[PDB]
Design a binder for this molecule. Structure first.
Ligand SMILES: *[C@@H]1O[C@H](CO)[C@@H](O[C@@H]2O[C@H](CO)[C@@H](O)[C@H](O)[C@H]2NC(C)=O)[C@H](O)[C@H]1NC(C)=O
Ligand SMILES: *[C@@H]1O[C@H](CO)[C@@H](O[C@@H]2O[C@H](CO)[C@@H](O)[C@H](O)[C@H]2NC(C)=O)[C@H](O)[C@H]1NC(C)=O
Ligand SMILES: *[C@@H]1O[C@H](CO)[C@@H](O)[C@H](O)[C@H]1NC(C)=O
Ligand SMILES: *[C@@H]1O[C@H](CO)[C@@H](O)[C@H](O)[C@H]1NC(C)=O
Ligand SMILES: *[C@@H]1O[C@H](CO)[C@@H](O)[C@H](O)[C@H]1NC(C)=O
Ligand SMILES: *[C@@H]1O[C@H](CO)[C@@H](O)[C@H](O)[C@H]1NC(C)=O
Lengths: 37, 31, 148, 99
């Protein structure tokens, strides 16, 4: 029931710069102005 | 050891680096 | 009149492996003579039926059975018993457990505001000093039991 | 054996790339699975065209789709918390000399 969709594209994917993204809270622990490494 | 020489972040963010008693030809401008 | 819908297998080549299951219905072959899919001497249908009837002595009446089998593969966790609780008291040196956090001290109403996924708060030098009550979801400070 | 998902939604203006600011990601779910994962793929939604009877690639219409994919690595991060409990900024050591 599934379709051939893929058209061959010569172009490669580009590259960008993740300046400062993708940071998360690695713990349910709460904190208040504590510099944590 | 490796030491970092900084004028202070309230002045600049440039930095210099001292490789202690290492001959400067085997470290890996101003050398 | 007899409930003939409850069958059981009474002939098999070899005993089952544990937790193995066999719903086939091939004609059993007792003797050496091949069977060719027809009944006869030493060629038996392998399923019999309890004919249950309400006027049967105990030990012939139907019993329903459920077998619970707890297994422990190598995952991270799963189902288990249920949890209980008590009554979060305040202003008394107490011995507390907050869904895992075990401690001692006086509990007091707070005025800090966690983010709505944070359970407990820590100090500098890393000691638990606030918690959130799981049931009512309010922040409570934890001060130590007076000593000296 | 756990599958953890973190998420964030942020409004930005017309930039060609990822923005320059800072935004932390709050956790969504921690699914207890125990699944061995080495590959993944993205699901896209296509609409049925109704201008042709067939099911082929001409029978489905679509807009424009693009995304950004980067890979995680074990690093050490210094996080600066706020008084409300909010990571407002951070730095990744082993990044440069000063860091
Ligand atoms: C879990 O159930 C308890 C009650 O069994 C809920 O407690 C209620 O909390 C509200 C606060 O919004 C009070 O107004 C009610 O009077 C409480 N009920 C009782 C019987 O004390 C509790 O809120 C539930 N958990 C969650 C997350 O909602
Ligand atoms: C998870 O699945 C991958 C499948 O790729 C396992 O990694 C190895 O993959 C190569 C590529 O086909 C195989 O030739 C190897 O035999 C796989 N390793 C092993 C030990 O079989 C990976 O091991 C799997 N992880 C777990 C925990 O089973
Ligand atoms: C396209 O679909 C046909 C069946 O509709 C299939 O036989 C063929 O392998 C598909 N093409 C590719 C490149 O897989
Ligand atoms: C530090 O910064 C403050 C304000 O940015 C400035 O007044 C002060 O002179 C700075 N100190 C030095 C040593 O530059
Ligand atoms: C470093 O090595 C070079 C090459 O032998 C040598 O000429 C130089 O003197 C060495 N450094 C010092 C401080 O002697
Ligand atoms: C969060 O901190 C800001 C200052 O950074 C303060 O003005 C505000 O009252 C705090 N609390 C909130 C938003 O609940």
């Amino acid at each position: 029931q599934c379709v051939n969709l893929t058209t061959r594209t010569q172009l490669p994917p580009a590259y960008t710069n993740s300046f400062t993204r993708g940071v998360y809270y690695p713990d349910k622990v709460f904190r208040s102005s504590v510099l944590h490494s | 050891g490796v030491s970092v020489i900084t004028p202070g972040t309230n002045t600049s963010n440039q930095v210099a680096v001292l490789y202690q008693d290492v001959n400067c030809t085997e470290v890996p401008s101003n050398v | 009149g007899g409930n003939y819908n409850y069958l059981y297998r009474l002939f098999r080549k070899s005993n089952l492996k544990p937790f193995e299951r066999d719903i086939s219905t091939e004609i059993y072959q007792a003797g050496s003579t091949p069977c060719n899919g027809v009944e006869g001497f030493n060629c038996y249908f392998p399923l019999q039926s309890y004919g249950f009837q309400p006027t049967n002595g105990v030990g012939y009446q139907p019993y329903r059975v459920v077998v619970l089998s707890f297994e422990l593969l190598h995952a991270p966790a799963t189902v288990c018993g249920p949890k209980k609780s008590t009554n979060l008291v305040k202003n008394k040196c107490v011995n507390f457990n907050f869904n895992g956090l075990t401690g001692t001290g006086v509990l007091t109403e707070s005025n800090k505001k966690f983010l709505p996924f944070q359970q407990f708060g820590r100090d500098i030098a890393d000691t638990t000093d606030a918690v959130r009550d799981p049931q009512t979801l309010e922040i409570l400070d934890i001060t130590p039991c007076s000593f000296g | 054996g756990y599958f953890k998902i973190y998420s964030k939604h942020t409004p930005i203006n017309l930039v060609r790339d990822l923005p320059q600011g800072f935004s932390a990601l709050e956790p969504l779910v921690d699914l207890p699975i125990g699944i061995n994962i080495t590959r993944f793929q993205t699901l896209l939604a296509l609409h049925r065209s109704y201008l042709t009877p067939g099911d082929s690639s001409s029978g489905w219409t679509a807009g424009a789709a693009a995304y950004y994919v980067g890979y995680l690595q074990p690093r050490t991060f210094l996080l600066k918390y706020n008084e409300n409990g909010t990571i407002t900024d951070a730095v990744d050591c082993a990044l440069d000399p000063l860091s």
